[PDB]
């Protein structure tokens, strides 16, 4: 997997230049919507009723 580490470091170098310009937002810094998700043990509600 030599192509694997070559893409990980490319993403690290590309996400450092992209975040250099994208870190100057406006007005009250409101947080970005953290999405709810499936939590472990939720699919076991069918076999309890």
């Amino acid at each position: 997997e030599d192509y694997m580490e070559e893409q990980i470091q490319l993403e690290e170098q590309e996400l450092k230049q992209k975040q250099l310009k994208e870190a100057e937002g406006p007005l009250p810094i409101k947080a970005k919507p953290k999405q709810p998700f499936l939590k472990r043990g939720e699919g076991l509600a069918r076999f309890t009723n």
């Binding site: 069918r46 076999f47 309890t48």
Partner: protein
Amino acid sequence: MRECISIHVGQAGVQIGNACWELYCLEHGIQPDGQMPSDKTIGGGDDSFNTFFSETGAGKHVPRAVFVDLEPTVIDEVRTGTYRQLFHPEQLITGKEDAANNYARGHYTIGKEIIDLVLDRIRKLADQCTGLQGFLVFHSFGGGTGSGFTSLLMERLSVDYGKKSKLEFSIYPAPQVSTAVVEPYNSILTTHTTLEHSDCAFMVDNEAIYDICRRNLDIERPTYTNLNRLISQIVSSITASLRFDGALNVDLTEFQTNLVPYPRIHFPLATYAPVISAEKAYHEQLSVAEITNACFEPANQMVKCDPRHGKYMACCLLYRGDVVPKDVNAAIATIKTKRSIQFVDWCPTGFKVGINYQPPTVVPGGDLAKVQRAVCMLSNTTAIAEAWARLDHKFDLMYAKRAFVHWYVGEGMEEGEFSEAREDMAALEKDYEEVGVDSV
């Protein structure tokens, strides 16, 4: 007359049920259009078939039967068959989706919807009865409909027909024809909840039938068609006392009087003989002495077990055909002279006998051949607990891991019902051991 209503539940009960009626028609001379004409009629004045067959105002004899299944496939084959004319449309009740081999689904989820409709069509048959005796329930132990819906129906029937007797014919599971892994769960669950609502249960061990098919009928790999032809031949000899003029097991109560010592131990063992392959019918026929001795060979039992590993409580021999009463008396006296046939100390040691002189009947174009004389021995041996032991071992094997238990709880049942049903089988097995434990 003194009528009996047959209720067939699930695929197995429906399938065995139709094969029984096919034989009943041949025995009593009824054609597949309800007609009983001069030609096919028996004569002799035997009108005892009128307990199983109602009559329209046009000599049409209609079975007092109810067929129930939570799916159409099995009952659609009835309304499209040879006997599609024999039963009234309302006697065949079908659902849209089955109980998927889950007891809880038939007893609770799906079953609760078709239960009240079934009581209605049963009441409609019970209404044409001047003196209803009770019910004959044919069903499998392993089916979702067979185990669950039957259990539900028996609970209801006790409420709606208190004074009436309930007698079952239960297909006990075989690995060679098993449809589901949960078959032991369903069998223990149905037996527990049905135990107080049933007065006499005749288990039909499918492995025992498969074994007879392989050995006696020379069938390498018998289909359900093969198994069904044999089970009807046996179940018909058990119910013939109810549909013919006789002196033994004349009515439903007599089954309990002659076979059930006390209510819980209501599982008699049927041993039918002779079972002869069609290719071997033109050999000198077996005598009354030969076929009486065959009832004591476990190879011919309808449930796999060894009666020699237990004790007897009751024994009824129901002969049919060219049986001379004096020969039966000699054969019985020979049996009585056997130290291996042991009765419990608290039960009377005897053999009740009945001979129907009408020649025995087989389905033409079938793996079974016509004999001059045959017998069915209905015995209540404490060795029938061997059959429960096999189920309880496989039940404890999975319940210790809670395997598949989720499918049941998610379908309106509680986990404690499995603990509850198994405590009943431990109580039953310990009881069977504790009564056949001694004699001198």
